[PDB]
Amino acid sequence: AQNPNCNIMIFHPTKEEFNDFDKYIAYMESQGAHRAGLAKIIPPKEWKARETYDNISEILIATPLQQVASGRAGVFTQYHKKKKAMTVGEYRHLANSKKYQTPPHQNFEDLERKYWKNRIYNSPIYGADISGSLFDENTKQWNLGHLGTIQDLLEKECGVVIEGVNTPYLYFGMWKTTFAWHTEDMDLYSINYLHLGEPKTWYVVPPEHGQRLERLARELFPGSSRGCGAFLRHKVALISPTVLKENGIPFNRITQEAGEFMVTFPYGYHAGFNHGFNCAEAINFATPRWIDYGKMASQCSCGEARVTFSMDAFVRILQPERYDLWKR
Ligand SMILES: O=[N+]([O-])c1ccc(O)c(O)c1
Ligand SMILES: O=[N+]([O-])c1ccc(O)c(O)c1
Ligand SMILES: O=[N+]([O-])c1ccc(O)c(O)c1
Ligand SMILES: O=[N+]([O-])c1ccc(O)c(O)c1
Ligand SMILES: O=C(O)CNC(=O)C(=O)O
Ligand code: NI
Ligand SMILES: [Zn+2]
């Protein structure tokens, strides 16, 4: 078996290998990449997402989110307080202000230490889930707005045509902005391109050990667990690498830099934080191997977890019992 220790693998496709997206994902999996739950892909040197990032300041962040923490330094929840709209130019200026800017630090490790020590004492503002794309329309390779759709994948594999669309989302981050422990909707893949700015650190649990993380989460967030059988779908729970280690949860970490892609694999729990002002673009996608994960994906129906219009059809076709119950 390839990659039995479930290490995060890093790939350097040639420009020829970068043409066929589906084929390269399949290649990565043939090398065991999916066992980690996360892979890094460094594009060939000949490739670029767009010419420049010079004219992005007038993009609007309609609903910036202030991420307010509760709990302990290594075990906390965050809730998102809505703030007034601001442009990306205004957001960048805010990110670089004394209140919000990245502190002096020696290296990524020092910054990671500072993050877990001090995150709960601040409330950074995140511009998340902004529908849009920063890929040039002429970028033909790994353009996250030109991928085959999940709806077409389902149709190709299962022969059923369904409604729905899926399009990319932009994320504008600043120091300490945080993404909570989660898998994707319907345990889909995701792909994430860091367009510009400071790095993003990722933590990931191998899919074969995802239930170990769930069990720990139930212990660490007992009220949340009682409220919903799939409360990690709420995207509110953070657990530090120190606490994971103390509880013997298998995981890995890696830092993504500007110009790099990350792929998360079905049922790969992940969490992380931004180092400073940056912009990422991400989208969910599927492969034939995803279908069985989609069938088995847990669902939130306590009401908390927000779900796209397109996720309806996935549940309807792949989990008809759960769909029928959700109706009545
Ligand atoms: O940027 N890419 O991905 C490229 C650039 C040139 C090529 O000839 C190619 O096959 C891929
Ligand atoms: O703020 N809360 O609700 C919290 C904070 C930490 C926890 O471990 C928790 O179960 C709930
Ligand atoms: O709050 N902490 O630091 C904690 C809480 C629970 C744990 O099991 C742990 O190893 C650390
Ligand atoms: O455990 N699962 O994954 C299940 C259990 C029942 C279902 O009806 C389902 O669609 C998935
Ligand atoms: O970048 C973020 O804030 C969160 N991204 C993801 O969870 C992802 O790409 O799957
Ligand atoms: Ni994700
Ligand atoms: Zn719920």
From Swiss-Prot:
Entry comment on modification after translation: Ubiquitinated via 'Lys-63'-linked ubiquitin chains. Deubiquitinated by USP14 with the help of TRIM14 leading to stabilization.
GO molecular function: chromatin DNA binding; damaged DNA binding; histone demethylase activity; histone H3K9 demethylase activity; histone H3K9me2/H3K9me3 demethylase activity; metal ion binding
Gene Ontology BP annotations: cellular response to ionizing radiation; chromatin remodeling; double-strand break repair via homologous recombination; inflammatory response; positive regulation of chromatin binding; positive regulation of double-strand break repair via nonhomologous end joining; regulation of gene expression; regulation of protein phosphorylation
Enzyme class: oxidoreductase
GO CC terms, sorted: blood microparticle; chromatin; nucleoplasm; nucleus; pericentric heterochromatin; site of double-strand break
Cofactor dependence: Fe(2+)
Entry EC no(s): 1.14.11.66
Sorted UniProt keywords: ADP-ribosylation, Chromatin regulator, Dioxygenase, Iron, Metal-binding, Nucleus, Oxidoreductase, Transcription, Transcription regulation, Ubl conjugation, Zinc
Record's keyword annotation contains Nucleus: yes
Ranges for domain JmjC: 136-302
Family, similarity comment: Belongs to the JHDM3 histone demethylase family.
UniProt name for this protein: Lysine-specific demethylase 4D
Gene it is expressed from: KDM4D
